[PDB]
Amino acid sequence: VCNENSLFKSLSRYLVRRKDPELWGSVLLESNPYRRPLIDQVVQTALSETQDPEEVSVTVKAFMTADLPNELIELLEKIVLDNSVFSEHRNLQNLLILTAIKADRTRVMEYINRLD
Amino acid sequence: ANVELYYRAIQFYLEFKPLLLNDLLMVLSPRLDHTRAVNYFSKVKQLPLVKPYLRSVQNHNNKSVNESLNNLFITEEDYQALRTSIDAYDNFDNISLAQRLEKHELIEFRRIAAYL
Numbered sequence: 413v414c415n416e417n418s419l420f421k422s423l424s425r426y427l428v429r430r431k432d433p434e435l436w437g438s439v440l441l442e443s444n445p446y447r448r449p450l451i452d453q454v455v456q457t458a459l460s461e462t463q464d465p466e467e468v469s470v471t472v473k474a475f476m477t478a479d480l481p482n483e484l485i486e487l488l489e490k491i492v493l494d495n496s497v498f499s500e501h502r503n504l505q506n507l508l509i510l511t512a513i514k515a516d517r518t519r520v521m522e523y524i525n526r527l528d
Numbered sequence: 529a530n531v532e533l534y535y536r537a538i539q540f541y542l543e544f545k546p547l548l549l550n551d552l553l554m555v556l557s558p559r560l561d562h563t564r565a566v567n568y569f570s571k572v573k574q575l576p577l578v579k580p581y582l583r584s585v586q587n588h589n590n591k592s593v594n595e596s597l598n599n600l601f602i603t604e605e606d607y608q609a610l611r612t613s614i615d616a617y618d619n620f621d622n623i624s625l626a627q628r629l630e631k632h633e634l635i636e637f638r639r640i641a642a643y644l
Contacts, residue, residue: 455529487529494559519561 415446421457423450428458428467436474455487462497472507486511493526531561535568542572553581563592576600586616594620602628607637614644 414423427435440447458471475485489508492498505527512520534556541549562585569575575582575596582596594617601610622644629641 491529518563 415444415450420450420453424454424457427471428461431467431470433470433474433477436471437478440474440478440480451484455491459491459496465498465502468492482511482515486515531559534560535565538565538568542574546574546577550578550580553578554584557581557585562588563590566592566596576603586613589617589619591619593617598625605634605637607634607640610637611640614640 414420427439439450458467472485472488474480475488485507489504489511492504493508498504508523508527509520512523538549538553541552566575569578579600582593582600586593586597597613598620601607601613604610625644626641629638632638632641
């Protein structure tokens with residue numbers, strides 16, 4: 413029903429509640445052209461709640477396991493990076509630098525320069 | 529998120545409404561590829577017009593910041609504020625700076641050459 417017509421923020425909410433990475437892999441299988449608009453909705457909606465990194469971890473697992481490549485995850489990285497509840501580094505900056513490696517882009521410099 | 533937006537809009541206002549652009553440059557501060565912007569302004573030579581924002585973000589102590597202020601002073605031929613600036617940060621060489629000053633025709637400024 414959703415992709416048919418909806419603001420899929422609610423769908424995310426279902427996801428960010430129903431912790432089912434396999435359900436992501438269902439959502440995330442790249443043959444859906446509408447996979448782009450929905451991820452464009454998640455790149456801001458998923459961050460709204462920000463209570464505990466459970467679904468965060470789960471969705472980044474889904475990303476790396478479905479191999480969500482550069483240009484896709486680093487979005488998540490930087491957005492959760494800047495001034496969130498999470499100023500800690502639970503593999504956060506670490507996968508950040510890993511993506512920096514998989515990216516090899518000048519951005520890495522200032523990323524360091526903000527990293528601690 | 530994506531930033532090409534910024535470049536397009538600024539190129540426009542540059543071309544159309546720089547009076548309406550300056551302010552915006554300030555408003556778009558936090559997340560920025562500042563150095564690419566300053567390279568672009570070098571290309572457009574109108575960095576002296578965007579000087580306010582420059583003096584604003586002066587804090588971050590980047591090579592770009594340095595060279596910007598330096599050439600602005602060269603063109604400007606100021607020393608007092610130049611003294612302040614050069615003392616404010618360190619992330620830049622001074623050899624070429626000494627080369628500039630050694631013929632500055634102004635021992636007052638060549639005094640600063642000796643200082644550095």
